Amino acid sequence: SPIETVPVKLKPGMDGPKVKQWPKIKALVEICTEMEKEGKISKIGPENPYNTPVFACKKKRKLVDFRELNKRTQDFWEVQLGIPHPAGLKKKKSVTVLDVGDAYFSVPLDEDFRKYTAFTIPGIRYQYNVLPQGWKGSPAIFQSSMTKILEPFKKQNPDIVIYQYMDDLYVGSDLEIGQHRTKIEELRQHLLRWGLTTPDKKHQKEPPFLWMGYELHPDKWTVQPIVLPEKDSWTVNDIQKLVGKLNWASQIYPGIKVRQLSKLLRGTKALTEVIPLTEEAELELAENREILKEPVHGVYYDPSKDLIAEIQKQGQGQWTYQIYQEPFKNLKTGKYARMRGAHTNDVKQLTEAVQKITTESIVIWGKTPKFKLPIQKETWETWWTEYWQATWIPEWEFVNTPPLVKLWYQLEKEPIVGAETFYVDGAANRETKLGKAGYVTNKGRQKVVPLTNTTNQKTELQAIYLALQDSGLEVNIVTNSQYALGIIQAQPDKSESELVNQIIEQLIKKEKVYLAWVPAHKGIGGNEQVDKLVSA
Amino acid sequence: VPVKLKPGMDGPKVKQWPLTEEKIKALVEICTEMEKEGKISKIGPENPYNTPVFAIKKKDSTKWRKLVDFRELNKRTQDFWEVQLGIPHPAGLKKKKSVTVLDVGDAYFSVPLDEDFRKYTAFTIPSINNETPGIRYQYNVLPQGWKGSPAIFQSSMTKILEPFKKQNPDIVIYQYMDDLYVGSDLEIGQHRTKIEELRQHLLRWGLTTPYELHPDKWTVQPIVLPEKDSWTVNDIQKLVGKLNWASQIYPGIKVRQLSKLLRGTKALTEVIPLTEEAELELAENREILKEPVHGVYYDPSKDLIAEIQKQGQGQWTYQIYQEPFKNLKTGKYARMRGAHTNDVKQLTEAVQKITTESIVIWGKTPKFKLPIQKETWETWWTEYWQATWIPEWEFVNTPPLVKLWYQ
DNA sequence: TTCCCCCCCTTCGGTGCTTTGCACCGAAGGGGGGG
Ligand SMILES: Cn1c(Cn2ccc(C(F)(F)F)c(Oc3cc(Cl)cc(C#N)c3)c2=O)n[nH]c1=O
């Protein structure tokens, strides 16, 4: 019965909502009378003109419209910072899942705020004497009251482990099941002392247990069956559902790719047009279904051992990790396909995936795993020593299984003897949006090509392109644009722009390349000539 | 002591980053004892404000200290820190000989906090695997890290220091956050005993209180030019580019005779002999670079920006400036202890050294421009941090291709 | 006349330079998980 109230107010500068009164009157009150029998709903006089849009559903159901009150209620901090994950659950000998019913209907709301959650059925005006369903502050207040109730019991019993998630308790113990039933009985009695009507035998469970897409067996765990829709005419909505289901199922199924399935979503107009699939997307979906065809399982945590988060590369910006504590007995499986930045190579994506796995594992288990990256230590040293950022990877070993990540081409550090030198430049007019890109070598050979709808950066990159076309194996390109040199220095593998892609395709073939920057419009050797050519 | 926000700003609403199990279960065992003796009291959902919190280990003392990220609450209540009362920076501390750093944070654990303001200083201890909702807390006594606390305790600290200051006026006393800089001209052997005497005197005031930094060694480094007899075309091009880039910072820089020296489309490698006119021009340029930059002055109204570059081989460079292309200070940091351990480490002690230098010299922490990706910094900057302050930083993404400070 | 928490991709706007294009980041829209 007694639960201490929590202060609740409104955002300053306005009163409660007041929507027009609505003109069921006796049949629906019978349901509400039962609430008035216990004390869920009270009697409000005409001195409280606040009103909310009433609404009644037929349950297969007062779905009250709170949106104005929901908007004007003061800010409540969202203390639920995540969702418990099965892979972080320690193997408990005895388990019991309690589903607290009448959760929001047994927490008293503060007397000052009661008048705002009004209800109009004309007389008698209703007000929610308890925590309303769908209100903004209901989850936080209920969760904090549950924590305040459950803290003394957890202090009394240290070996009992209780996971709370909104309106549900999950209790585990190393005790024998005969004593575990007893301990659950004292837990239920203590909970019922405070007015919470915890079920005694109706909803208590025995293995397997069920949670959000989570079947929990005595010594394993798995997702609930993910049925991927099968159809011949896929619209965008079905593609979105497919992508979501595959992303959810990737938590335990290894080897999932959804990049080509999502690429079809690009360019669509509305949520109804039918987008035909390609061969890439169809093959990827067939592979996903045929790897999802067999059942796979996870394992629970074990603090006595060390996590080991392997990483593999599935080709063209897709990575997969299998966090485990025992070989071939996974704890968790994931995937990293996010590509940030328009110009990156494989090592940058690998270290991004490493940081992602580190933060996920700190969230879930509490300690960073021992990575086994598919990268040679010498390659990582070469990358991180000669690069302008501060890249780190916590602790790792090497995995000798291809495909293997490595740097592709190495720009030379010093000018190379006996090889040709090219002076490239491009210029594009601001208004006409037309330009020209050209180069002058040391032998006096000059070549220029007009270009259309290419700006200064574009035409500078095309000048680099011509220099790489017309040169030999070794070459020294000299530029005056900072952007071009910056793009080519970071040693990218692939880029969203195709011009950078072909530049990289040529840099792969060349044996030795050196790029040097010189200031523009200041008369440095061949810059005058290559600017006179583009100044025509 | 009433405390108020700056009107028209919402309170701190920053989310808590995930923490290691060791850090979480040390934070819990610190916060329990803090709550037992009234320092912090639990709070409910109705408090909509939150600031991060995380555990560090100072000087590897095997014990754990608790930092609360107050970088936003300070930005809100800068009025209580710069308008109400802020201690002016002693101008003589720039030229001092040796300074020691002490912590008087525990001395701040006695002054009660403003009754209305407490609800803003709320933090949250997370839980592993989201087992239970994060245990929330709020502060009841003055907090260690908020710039309002030095403003409140300035009078009390001054009354504490008046006997020792009067007895020994030679030492210069400065206070930033809850840290104290004591600056002595005495010998190194006696300076330590004098600092121990100061600590004992602080103890004798009923307030408990728990390194020989030498400010005078900090001088603006001069940018240097290459020097060799056989100047290749590529090296002459690099020199001309460097002179162009330095023409902004030094108005007297002139590069014209070398421009006439490079006329033909010559190869970058073949040696081009350098005449006597260019030798005279190089000598004059080095003479100009011998003098320091002219025109840089410190304006307390504007903010300090500190840029960091990585030169590889465990070398970093920093430039503290207010108006762009006019560096208020330049430097270089190098340590082989980080490289054997990590690389974000090197950056972390680099930031600590820069911020300590700027507090001692100017009197306020710079806004950093780190050369690091945000995720790999926010993940790992708590494992090596050891200073009870946290300067504001922004991350750079465009590569600083210039890197002409060390060519 | 359902409220939120969390993840993933895609598109839009702000933002700072690289300076008027280009490359970042975050916030919004779909999906997924239900509680
Ligand atoms: C099955 N199982 C286990 C695994 N296990 C271990 C500890 C707990 C604890 F009581 F701590 F919550 C469990 O209760 C939960 C927790 C969560 Cl997030 C979801 C669900 C569901 N549906 C049940 C639990 O399922 N150990 N031994 C055994 O048979």
Name the shape of chain B in a single word: globular
Count of beta strands of chain A: 21
The pair of chains with the biggest contact is: A-B, 76 and 66 residues
Secondary structure: number of strands of chain B: 14
The profile of the biggest β sheet of chain A is: 5 strands, mixed
Helix content of chain B: 25-40%
Q: In percent terms, what proportion of residues of chain A is strand?
A: 15-25%
The N- and C-terminal alpha carbons of chain A lie at a distance of: 90 Å
* Number of structural domains of chain A: 5
Structural class of chain A: alpha+beta
Order of helices and strands of chain B: HEEEHHEEEHEEHHHHEEEEHHEHE
Instruction: Work out the helix count of chain B.
Output: 11
**Broad shape of chain A:** elongated
Structural class of chain B: alpha+beta
Largest sheet of chain B: 6 strands, mixed
Bound molecules: the ligand Cn1c(Cn2ccc(C(F)(F)F)c(Oc3cc(Cl)cc(C#N)c3)c2=O)n[nH]c1=O
How would you describe what is shown here?
Chain A: Heterodimer of p66 RT and p51 RT (RT p66/p51). Heterodimerization of RT is essential for DNA polymerase activity. The overall folding of the subdomains is similar in p66 RT and p51 RT but the spatial arrangements of the subdomains are dramatically different. Chain A: It comes from Human immunodeficiency virus type 1 group M subtype B (isolate BH10). Chain A: It is found in: Virion. Chain A: This is Reverse transcriptase/ribonuclease H. The PDB classes it as transferase. Keywords: Reverse transcriptase, RT-aptamer complex, non-nucleoside inhibitor, nnrti, transferase. The complex is a heterodimer of chains A (536) and B (407). With 536 residues, chain A is of the alpha+beta class. Chain A has 5 domains: 113 residues, no CATH class; 94 residues, no CATH class; 94 residues, no CATH class; 107 residues, no CATH class; 128 residues, no CATH class. In chain A, the strands form 7 sheets. Chain A has a 5-stranded mixed beta sheet with strand order 18-17-16-19-21. In chain A, strand 16 and strand 17 form a beta hairpin. In chain A, helix 11 packs parallel to helix 13. The longest helix of chain A is centred in the N-terminal third of the chain and has 19 residues. Chain A is elongated and about 100 Å long. Chain B is of the alpha+beta class and 407 residues long. Chain B folds into 4 domains: 131 residues, no CATH class; 80 residues, no CATH class; 86 residues, no CATH class; 109 residues, no CATH class. Chain B contains 11 helices and 14 strands. In chain B, strands 9, 10, 11, 12, 13 and 14 form a 6-stranded mixed beta sheet that branches. In chain B, strands 1-6-5 form a 3-stranded antiparallel beta sheet, covered by helices on one side. Chain B has a 3-stranded antiparallel beta sheet with strand order 4-8-7. Chain B is globular, with a radius of gyration of 25 Å. Chain B starts with 20 loop residues before the first helix and ends in a 12-residue tail after the last strand. At the A-B interface, helix 4, strand 5, helix 9, helix 12 and strand 21 of A face helix 6, helix 10 and helix 11 of B. The structure holds ligand 2KW. Chain A binds one DNA strand of 35 nucleotides through helix 4, helix 6, helix 11 and helix 12.
